[PDB]
């Protein structure tokens, strides 16, 4: 589904992303915005047989398995289809694992280019969460 900005903020806060390994809630909301526009159904094909899935565009080459990607590593040990659910549980758990690597949120190019080092709290500011 397509989340409302505030609706996603509340959901992400509920799912423990606010202050997860130091990253404030706005960071994840902003990343969600630029990656898929709060759309859990968003998918994107890449030059390799890999595909990005969900509200946070998680790659099938490293993080999830769709049974049709060469060199799949399935780091999150999860079916990519689980990342398309209107239920963000799986996408969040996987994100938390990605950000647990030495590079943290730098895994998301869009976050680096349009969120990293900005007033990301602007993204949850206004919402009555």
């Amino acid at each position: 589904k397509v989340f409302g900005r505030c609706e996603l903020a509340a959901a992400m806060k509920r799912h423990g992303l606010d202050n997860y390994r130091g990253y404030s809630l706005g960071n994840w909301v902003c990343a969600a915005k630029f990656e898929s526009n709060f759309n859990t159904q968003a998918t994107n094909r890449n030059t390799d047989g890999s595909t990005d899935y969900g509200i946070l565009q998680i790659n099938s080459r490293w993080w999830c398995n769709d049974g049709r990607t060469p060199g799949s590593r399935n780091l999150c040990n999860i079916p990519c289809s689980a990342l398309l659910s209107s239920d963000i549980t799986a996408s969040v758990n996987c994100a938390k694992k990605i950000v647990s690597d030495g590079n943290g949120m730098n895994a998301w190019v869009a976050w680096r280019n349009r969120c990293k080092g900005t007033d990301v709290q602007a993204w949850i500011r206004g919402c009555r969460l």
């Epitope: 423990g16 606010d18 997860y20 390994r21 780091l75």
Partner: antibody, heavy 113, light 109 residues
Framework: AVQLQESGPSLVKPSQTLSLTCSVT????????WSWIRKFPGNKLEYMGY???????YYHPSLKSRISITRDTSKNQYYLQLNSVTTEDTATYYC???????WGAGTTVTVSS | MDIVLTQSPATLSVTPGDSVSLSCRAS??????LHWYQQKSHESPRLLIK???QSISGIPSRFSGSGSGTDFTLSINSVETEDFGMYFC?????????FGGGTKLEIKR
């Protein structure tokens, strides 16, 4: 099904180095984040640190300077190195996946002279 | 500073068939990043609940968790014969990850 198994000297002398090995079977060491957890007497658990799928590491600050975690991609194992041990390092050592879904049987390491 | 997790009571004696609630409290808010482990004697820890209340496929349904922030609870509806032993909570919200002191589930007689 992925399985883990710890191995190493069960006895280490004070001031010397503690070394353990965790053999990954069923999958690749590159297919997950792996960690070392120790249990001191009195049921006191300590998360020593972990090594990512990329080889990146995070160490418990209390152990920073004494600890080192590495892996070997061709043998599918990762290791723990703990220097300048003292009797206080005596404990049961376990290797586990980051997700906590898999654990080795654990192996006791005793520091004594 | 390192997050401290306090579990209570230290020990709990119960009769199989009874329900019990185990408490874990954090010195700081950790949202839903609290996990529950069971460790029986001579066995390594087994993950029962992840992220405060998510169930693990393969774990008996009598096990469930709740709470958020700094107050969490592990519930066991009708404790069973093979459920006795140590129960520990662990947070993964901040590094270093930390474990609580654990609660011992013992048999009442």
């Amino acid at each position: 099904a992925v399985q883990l198994q710890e191995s190493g000297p069960s006895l280490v002398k004070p001031s010397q180095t503690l070394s353990l090995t965790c053999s990954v079977t069923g999958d690749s060491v590159t297919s997950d984040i792996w960690s070392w957890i120790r249990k001191f007497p009195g049921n006191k658990l300590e998360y020593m640190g972990y090594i990512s799928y990329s080889g990146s590491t995070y160490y418990h600050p209390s152990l920073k300077s004494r600890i080192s975690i590495t892996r070997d991609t061709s043998k599918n194992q990762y290791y723990l190195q703990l220097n300048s041990v003292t009797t206080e390092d005596t404990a049961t050592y376990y290797c586990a996946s980051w997700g906590g879904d898999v654990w080795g049987a654990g192996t006791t390491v005793t520091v004594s002279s | 500073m390192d997050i401290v997790l306090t579990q209570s009571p230290a020990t709990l004696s119960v009769t199989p068939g009874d329900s019990v609630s185990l408490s874990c409290r954090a010195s700081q808010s950790i949202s839903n990043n609290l996990h529950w482990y069971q460790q029986k004697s001579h066995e390594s820890p087994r993950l029962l609940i992840k992220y405060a209340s998510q169930s693990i496929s393969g774990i008996p349904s009598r096990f469930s968790g709740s709470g958020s922030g700094t107050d969490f609870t592990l519930s066991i509806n009708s404790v069973e014969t093979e459920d006795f032993g140590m129960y520990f909570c662990q947070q993964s919200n901040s590094w270093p990850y930390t474990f609580g002191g654990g609660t011992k589930l013992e048999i009442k007689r």
